[model samples]
Target: NKASVVANQLIPINTALTLIMMKAEVVTPMGIPAEEIPNLVGMQVNRAVPLGTTLMPDMVKNYEDGTTSPGLKSVVANQLIPINTALTLVMMKAEEVSPKGIPSEEISKLVGMQVNRAVYLDQTLMPDMVKNYE
Candidate 1:
């Protein structure tokens, strides 16, 4: 594979920059278009990855605590969020919950819950979606 961009070099939680495709790599997965690499210029590092290893989608988010990773979804308006139902947010609907997302470790806890509000397809469902109805 092409040892393009950074070439296993150590970038930081630093600012965004141009995609530098240089040397080859052992597992050089294809990165997004070089033009869009600027979108990841100032993004936070998802992990301590080598240069060429970040050649795939979602390798890093474009912001700190910002939801621009294209991994977000929504609950279309004009719908009914049935009450007292236990289901995962992803299995029911997804939206402005968290940029980092509902912690991959808490799926068992956040996966099941219900809404108390009338529901809005565009607004945040903070108190709407709850479990401890105390």
Candidate 2:
């Protein structure tokens, strides 16, 4: 895969990498074909995309596991979680946070990820909580 976008060097996060017909075997075996990976010439890195990864749509978004990494806390879910309000994302569990959950920073996937149920405090924000904003 010579023309594959291999980072000959480390490209910084959010920095756009240069895409030429540089090096890759040009293999596309179903599941979103490599040919479908829109020209990488101008796309910005979503998370520096690791070093050796073959790029995918997820790798080019502003979201990542680190999306919730910076802040996870046990703040009061003191207010009723109403629909269409700003999602403090005040209730989410992380690998390390246990009962202490993740709160949203400004750019949150949780923020507009519509809540399927009206939740009261004193309960864990179990998984499968939000519904798509359809």
TM-score of 2: 0.30
**Residue 106, model 1: Cα distance from true site in angstroms:** 18
Tens-digit lDDT track of model 2 for 1-134: 32444444555665655545212444332112334235434445535554445545345431112225544642223334664444444443222223333333332545435456765433234444555422
lDDT of 1 at 70: 41
lDDT at position 112, candidate 1: 59
In candidate 2, which residue pairs get closer than 3 Å at backbone N, Cα or C atoms, i.e. clash?
A: 1-24, 1-25, 2-23, 2-24, 3-23, 3-24, 4-23, 4-24
Writing each residue's lDDT as its tens digit, candidate 1 over 37-116 gives: 44434333434556555444345432222345544533322233465545455544443233233323444565655555
The C-alpha lDDT values of all candidates are 0.41, 0.41
Off by over 4 Å in 2: 1-4, 20-22, 25-39, 62-134
* lDDT value for model 2: 0.41
